[PDB]
Design a protein around this nucleic acid. Structure first.
Ligand SMILES: [Mg+2]
Ligand SMILES: [Mg+2]
Ligand SMILES: [Mg+2]
Ligand SMILES: [Mg+2]
Ligand SMILES: [Mg+2]
Ligand SMILES: [Mg+2]
Ligand SMILES: [Mg+2]
Ligand SMILES: [Mg+2]
Ligand SMILES: [Mg+2]
Ligand SMILES: [Mg+2]
Ligand SMILES: [Mg+2]
Ligand SMILES: [Mg+2]
Ligand SMILES: [Mg+2]
Ligand SMILES: [Mg+2]
Ligand SMILES: [Mg+2]
Ligand SMILES: [Mg+2]
Ligand SMILES: [Mg+2]
Lengths: 187, 175, 159, 168, 75
RNA sequence: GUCUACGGCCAUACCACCCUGAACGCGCCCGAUCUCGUCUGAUCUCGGAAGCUAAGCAGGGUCGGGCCUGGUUAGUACUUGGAUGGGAGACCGCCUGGGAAUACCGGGUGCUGUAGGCUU
RNA sequence: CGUUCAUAGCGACGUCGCUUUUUGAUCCUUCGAUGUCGGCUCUUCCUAUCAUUGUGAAGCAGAAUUCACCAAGCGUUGGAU
RNA sequence: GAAACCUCCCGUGGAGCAGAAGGGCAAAAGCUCGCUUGAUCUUGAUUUUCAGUACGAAUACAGACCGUGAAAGCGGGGCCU
RNA sequence: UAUCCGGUAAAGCGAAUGAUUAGAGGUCUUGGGGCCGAAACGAUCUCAACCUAUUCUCAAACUUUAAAUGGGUAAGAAGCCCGGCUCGCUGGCGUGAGCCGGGCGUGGAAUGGAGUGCCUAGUGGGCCACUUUUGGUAAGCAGAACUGGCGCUGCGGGAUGAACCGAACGCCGGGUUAAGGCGCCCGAUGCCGACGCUCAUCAGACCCCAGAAAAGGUGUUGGUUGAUAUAGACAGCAGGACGGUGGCCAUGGAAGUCGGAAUCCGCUAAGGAGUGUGUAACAACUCACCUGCCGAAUCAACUAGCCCUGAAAAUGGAUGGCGCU
RNA sequence: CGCAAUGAAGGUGAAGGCCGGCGCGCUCGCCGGCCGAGGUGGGAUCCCGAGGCCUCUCCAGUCCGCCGAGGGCGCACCACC
């Protein structure tokens, strides 16, 4: 006999990607190797990000990316994003960049290259810089999905600012007994 | 406690010193016990019943075996007791006749087992005193106070009962 | 089943101890609690206004607010299987500075003294605490008198 | 009277198994790394350690080892804990690799530190994997009771070596 | 058919499966439930910290210069 | 040596009776015009300074009660954990660690902050 | 108490037991059902012995008799309601 | 007159505090007078039951406006449950 | 290791609340009933309540005391220590809080990789044991605490068995063990094992467990305490067992002898104002002290071990069986 | 369906800073210039890097690394303002 809980003895992270798009698996073949034979933690991370869900590698806006390279230090440097770049119509002056992402939506692509930017694929990124030397590995905001507004402490539970699931907001869908103190009470 | 064959142990120990008792008084005890590890336990048990002095308050200074300086003599021990009953405690005084104080102590314990179904933890030995031929009270012992002591060996039942398990000869017990 | 009333079973809890009834001795009030000060709560019968609930008696916590004559004072409270840090307003009377912390600080101050000193010297001193060790080798001298024998003593029925 | 030193170091053996065990016991026993029955460790005594070894009296047998006992354990049953994998200390270059920072570079140094309880005992000992002893050849007097009352449990100070012989 | 009324038997053991976690600590805890007047005032102190900046900057420059003079005298 | 005012801790400071109280104080004390208040200048309020330590107050006294703190009680009672220990049960003994409370017998009987006196 | 005499035979005040031919407690078993009272008939078992065998006891002179033992071999009946 | 009212002395509370009990309370939380309406107007926080939802109950604050007192303060109902 | 909390076991009741025995001391108070008093705190008792020291025994809903086990904090970088700013708060000046800027690293033992968020099924009849504990005469009863089991779980042992004791399972070879065992069934004592005890015409024979008590026993074996005794015993037979004396009370008769208060002297060698038996009552008989034969040791009361008595149920029957001394 | 919310509704509807000037800088009102989604702690990662560590000799000495004391910009997420 041996007292251990085997409850939490398997770990649940992904090894490989669950997708079957051959071009992603090829990338992974490359970065799996790079992330073993090198020391470049970057490669370890890049590789780890290539196994995640579409939810879990969210779209970086051009505008956010612009503002993350402006930052004082990373001038003459490459952006990297293991999801996708999107346009920002609510930004106007677009600096010249150097980016890697799996995708750069058509609009955002035009914008980058018109401004004299540069766009790289991952296999290109590996050739350039196999150690991820000279990079700013960014990410999209993980918490942007509307989904999260529903999680948390359940609504109607004091100091829960938690969007409830309702068919259709308006006068008569919730917002009575339990919110109007007049009607019943409130949280 | 339990048993096997006991020895004697001279345990000595002192409540370990404080600011208020810079050179505390040592105490000594004839423990009888199957080994030094238990001897020392046994020592404490007795000390604490007497003095305010627990193992943690104290130390054992010198625990060591005590050998019989008269092994090859045969001696009559008186031996005083304080066992427990299925009822209340009693005191006794028994006599044994042995070559060693240990021997006689062990030879006591056993007897108490037999004659009173008294387990060891029930028993406290208070003194063991080698004695003269005289002063001995118990005629069990005193029938062995004789110079021309003689006796036959009478219905001398065979052992080696299974060496020859089967055989020709019915045995013979007269010797 | 029992009553969920507030004071239930505080017959000997909020009970001013033998020959300590009557007036709340002023010191009690005129001593000062800041934010971050650690405090052991302990109810008191006489002052009822701002009496803490019976679960928090003996329980000890930190002071996160200070109103004119009260203190908000974060405490822990195990509820079944999930301790809640939680915050209770207590009037000064049912509250004392905990000394638990003072002895740590005393020791910090002693380390920072012994760090400043013994730096110029070169010798690094044992700052850490170290558990109560095995009690060393030593001699016991029994000057002259031999150790006293101790006979176990006979039973006799007293009563 | 030369009252000698109280012992620095004792070897500790879980002598009873892994059912029905009280909750406070079990914690302590797993702080000692005694999760199988008949495992054993070196434990540097001090008030803190001792009071823990009390609380598991009925489950452990323990005492103050010999030098020999140290060697016989460490050579025969001594395995390093190296990248969390249990590993047989076959060669010194395994001990060194992980305790070299401590001036412990060979089998011999490890024993030294365990036996004398040097500065680095914690990390040398930790690095040893809990000693998977056999069942005691010649068995036990009684698994249940304390040594003093005719059993095997509790502190038997010197004698613990006798037990180490039959179980290594 | 009467039935068991209540107990706490297996309850401990469940609690401890997943932990009895001592509730999560943080530096920078909230100012929720803090005697309003107090808060106001500090919020105000906070409000006008940027006023009295140029003075503070200057003071820190003089302190830095005094450190550099002290380090030069040492060396 | 010690007091007064405001105090902290709140009997080692309380209670009972006894002695002793220099100087300064604090008192009792002598008055009712005003202030103020009573059935009553007793209390309270006010104006005083002829007496006096009688009392309060202070210091001490008492094989004093009380309180305070030790010892004893007692390694007693109890008690954590242990055993295919005992015992028909009632219960008990052991191992492992923790350990009280009376009666009884000793010692103690206010310490002290701030401000201002007296003994020049 | 028994003329007297605690104990032939009894036995208060107290107390310790056994038994499951009383009744209670209980609700384990059975509600996709174990035929719900008596009597009749038949067998067997028990002894806590009414009788009979052999015995000890008496406040057994005989007669009748209780008290106790070994003992369950053999019996223990017909009728009115 | 055992009980009326008057007076002196003793009195750690043995009374009283609406009610059950328990806590608490003596130049008071009791009794007696004087004035009064904090038992009013309003944000949130927190406790208690708790799921840590409500209700009720309470605890601290904060802003109004008032009461009382020389004032310090105390009061937003009932000494507390 | 520091530091708080607590009012349970215990203890206490010559400390509060309540409960309660007894005598000492008190016209405290006064009484109700007396006896001696006209009546009288006169004398003498008494019982009522009250009091002074004492004393007997108590408390889940009492308590001065007061453990063990137990519950909180704390054991450093979110910490220490300097410098300066902000404030509409607070304030004689000052506090207190908030901001910047610099300076300082292991801060009890042992162990361990942590943190975190979604979706979420079954479940929400339970039962058993040690210890604690309420109801109840109890219960394989009902109801709680604590841990651990069973339920979900096999395996060795407990003959058999949910829950005991050991130990927790991938498939196997060797070795070893636990708990339990070792006449034979049945693996292992086919040891020249050790010391006792014990005989049962109902022997006994192992956690949970499946069965007995009070009370007895010259059965035996141990202890404990007293005794006895060559100044001549102990048993065994033999000799006497009286006088003051129908002793006093009791007459219904108690001269030792239904009962009861007494309970001494003489002679004594020694006999009780008497153990019984018996008397209406006596009488008569009987039961110490000492001798003779006799001749060294002997007796009593307790106590505890095994054995026995106490001990009765129904199909034939179960230390598991055979059997075992 | 999403890119806007909130309010019963009438309805309203997500920016702030700095600097210089003019109104009394009045922590209020009006005119010019610059920056433009704030800050604190923690934060995978990136960047700089004193310094070593050798080279068959005594020094000079560019190239390549390995590590890196120390310092930075700091995603996402969290806590807080
Ligand atoms: Mg088990
Ligand atoms: Mg039931
Ligand atoms: Mg239910
Ligand atoms: Mg006057
Ligand atoms: Mg005077
Ligand atoms: Mg005087
Ligand atoms: Mg005194
Ligand atoms: Mg067990
Ligand atoms: Mg009669
Ligand atoms: Mg049928
Ligand atoms: Mg019969
Ligand atoms: Mg008043
Ligand atoms: Mg207000
Ligand atoms: Mg009132
Ligand atoms: Mg209680
Ligand atoms: Mg009690
Ligand atoms: Mg089920």
């Amino acid at each position: 006999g041996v007292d251990i809980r085997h409850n939490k003895d398997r770990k649940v992270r992904r090894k490989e990607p669950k997708s079957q798009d051959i071009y992603l698996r090829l990338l992974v073949k490359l970065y799996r190797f790079l992330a073993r034979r090198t020391n470049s933690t970057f490669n370890q991370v890049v590789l780890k990000r290539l196994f995640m869900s579409r939810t879990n590698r969210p779209p970086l806006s051009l505008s956010r990316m612009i503002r993350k390279m402006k930052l004082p230090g990373r001038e003459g440097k490459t952006a990297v994003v293991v999801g996708t770049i999107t346009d920002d119509v609510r930004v106007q002056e677009v600096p010249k960049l150097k980016v890697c992402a799996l995708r750069v939506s058509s609009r955002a692509r035009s914008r980058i290259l018109k401004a004299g930017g540069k766009i790289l694929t991952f296999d290109q990124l590996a050739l350039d810089s196999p150690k991820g030397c000279g990079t700013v590995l960014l990410s999209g905001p993980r918490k942007g999905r509307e989904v999260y507004r529903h999680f948390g402490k359940a609504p109607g539970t004091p100091h829960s600012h938690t969007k409830p699931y309702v068919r259709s907001k308006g006068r008569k869908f919730e917002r009575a007994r339990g919110r109007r103190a007049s009607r019943g009470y409130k949280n | 406690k339990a048993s096997g064959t006991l020895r004697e142990y001279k345990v000595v120990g002192r409540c370990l010193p404080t600011p208020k008792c810079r050179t505390p008084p040592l105490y000594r005890m004839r423990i009888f016990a199957p080994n030094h590890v238990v001897a020392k336990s046994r020592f404490w048990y007795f000390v604490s019943q007497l003095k305010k002095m627990k193992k943690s308050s104290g130390e054992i200074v010198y625990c060591g075996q005590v050998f019989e300086k008269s092994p090859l003599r045969v001696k009559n021990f008186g031996i005083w007791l304080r066992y427990d009953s299925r009822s209340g405690t009693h005191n006794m005084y028994r006599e044994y006749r042995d070559l060693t104080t240990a021997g006689a102590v062990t030879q006591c314990y056993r007897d108490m087992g037999a004659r009173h179904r008294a387990r060891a933890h029930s028993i406290q030995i208070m003194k063991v005193e080698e004695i003269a031929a005289s002063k001995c009270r118990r005629p069990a012992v005193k029938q062995f106070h004789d110079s021309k002591i003689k006796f036959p060996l009478p219905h001398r039942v065979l052992r080696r009962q299974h060496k020859p398990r089967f055989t020709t000869k019915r045995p013979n017990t007269f010797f | 089943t029992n009553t969920k009333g507030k004071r239930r079973g505080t017959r000997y809890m909020f009970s001013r101890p033998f020959r300590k009834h009557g007036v709340v001795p002023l010191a009690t009030y005129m001593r000062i609690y800041k934010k971050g000060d650690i405090v052991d709560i302990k109810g008191m019968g006489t002052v009822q206004k701002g009496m803490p609930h019976k679960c928090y008696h003996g329980k000890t916590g930190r002071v996160y607010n200070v109103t004119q004559h009260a203190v908000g004072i974060v405490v822990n409270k195990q509820v079944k299987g999930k301790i809640l840090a939680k915050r209770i307003n207590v009037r000064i009377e049912h509250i004392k500075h905990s000394k638990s912390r003072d002895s740590f600080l005393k020791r910090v101050k002693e380390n920072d003294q012994k760090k400043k000193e013994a730096k110029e010297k070169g010798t690094w001193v044992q700052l850490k605490r170290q558990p109560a060790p095995p009690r060393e080798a030593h001699f016991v001298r029994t000057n002259g008198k031999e150790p006293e024998l101790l006979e176990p003593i006979p039973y006799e029925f007293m009563a | 009277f030369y009252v000698p030193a109280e012992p620095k170091l004792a070897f500790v053996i879980r002598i009873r198994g892994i059912n029905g065990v009280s909750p406070k016991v079990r914690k302590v026993l797993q702080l000692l790394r005694l999760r199988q029955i008949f495992n054993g460790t070196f434990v540097k005594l001090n008030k803190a350690s001792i009071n823990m070894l009390r609380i598991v009296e009925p489950y452990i047998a323990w005492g103050y080892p010999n030098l020999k006992s140290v060697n016989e354990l460490i050579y025969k049953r001594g395995y390093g804990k190296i990248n969390k994998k249990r590993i047989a200390l076959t060669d010194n270059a395994l001990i060194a690799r992980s305790l070299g920072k401590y001036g412990i570079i060979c089998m011999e140094d490890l024993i030294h530190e365990i036996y004398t309880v040097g500065k680095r005992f914690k990390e040398a000992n930790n690095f040893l994997w809990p000693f998977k002893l056999s069942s005691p050849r010649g068995g036990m007097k009684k698994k249940t009771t304390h040594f003093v009352e005719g059993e095997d449990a509790g502190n038997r100070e010197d004698q613990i070596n006798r037990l180490i012989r039959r179980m290594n | 058919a009467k039935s068991k009324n209540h107990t706490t038997h297996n309850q401990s053991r469940k609690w401890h499966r997943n932990g009895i976690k001592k509730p999560r600590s943080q530096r920078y805890e909230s100012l929720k439930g803090v005697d309003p007047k107090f808060l106001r005032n500090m919020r105000f102190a906070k409000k006008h910290n940027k006023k009295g900046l140029k003075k503070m900057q200057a003071n820190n420059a003089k302190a830095m210069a005094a450190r550099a003079e002290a380090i030069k005298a040492l060396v």
